[PDB]
């Protein structure tokens, strides 16, 4: 499947995608202001993310920091991100469908959209100012907007017991962008596209 990734913000991000135990093509990229990059997923990737990094530093041999998303210091990602991450997450060729969904389940850093450029399915969104509305207590330093379950290590938020329920946290990710999962047992806002589908993420979609 083609991604092609946007950056539409008028910052620079350093976009990422890994599959957890590797990369998705290169891992990751420096995005300018209106950059775009265009990988390759490999068919009947599951458990795929992308997600941007900010304020990031890299040396010449691909080693750094980001205050937001960093994967273990390197500039292309084999590994996820740290929190808090907006995410794209996709399942592809699975029966014949792809899966995909935005999630603030690890929290929030750059507004994203994720559209299917293909035919047979919709887009979803997440566009609000998380960053400005959030909570006292889930505000990152670094920038963004942590979930719950980094900041407070409980069994609640963390959904540790596959039984947990929406909390004042989760409803303030949710009544912002109701189209992106807020907790790890929220009603599923995946949506189901057709089988090798390419895709568009495009970060700050409406700024």
């Not at 599959?19 to 990229?29: E, N, Q, T, W």
């Not at 330093?141 to 379950?149: K, W, Y």
């Not at 949710?174 to 806002?189: G, H, I, M, N, Q």
């Amino acid at each position: 499947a083609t991604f092609e990734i946007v950056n539409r913000c008028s910052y620079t991000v350093w976009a990422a995608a890994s599959k957890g135990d590797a990369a998705l093509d290169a891992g990751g990229r420096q995005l300018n202001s209106g950059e775009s990059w265009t990988i390759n997923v490999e068919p009947g990737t599951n458990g795929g993310k992308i997600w941007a990094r900010t304020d990031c530093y890299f040396d010449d041999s691909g080693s750094g920091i980001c205050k937001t998303g960093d994967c273990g210091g390197l500039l292309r990602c084999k590994r996820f991100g740290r929190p808090p991450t907006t995410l794209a997450e996709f399942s592809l060729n699975q029966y014949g469908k792809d899966y995909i969904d935005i999630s603030n389940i690890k929290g929030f850093n750059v507004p994203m959209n994720f559209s299917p450029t293909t035919r047979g399915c919709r887009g979803v969104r997440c566009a609000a100012d998380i960053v400005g509305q959030c909570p006292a207590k889930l505000k990152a330093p670094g920038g963004g907007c942590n979930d719950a379950c980094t900041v407070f290590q409980t069994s609640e938020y963390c959904c540790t017991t596959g039984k947990c329920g929406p909390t004042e946290y989760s409803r303030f990710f949710k009544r912002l962008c109701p189209d992106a999962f807020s907790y790890v047992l929220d009603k599923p806002t995946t949506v189901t596209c057709p089988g090798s589908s390419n895709y568009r993420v495009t970060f700050c979609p409406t700024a």
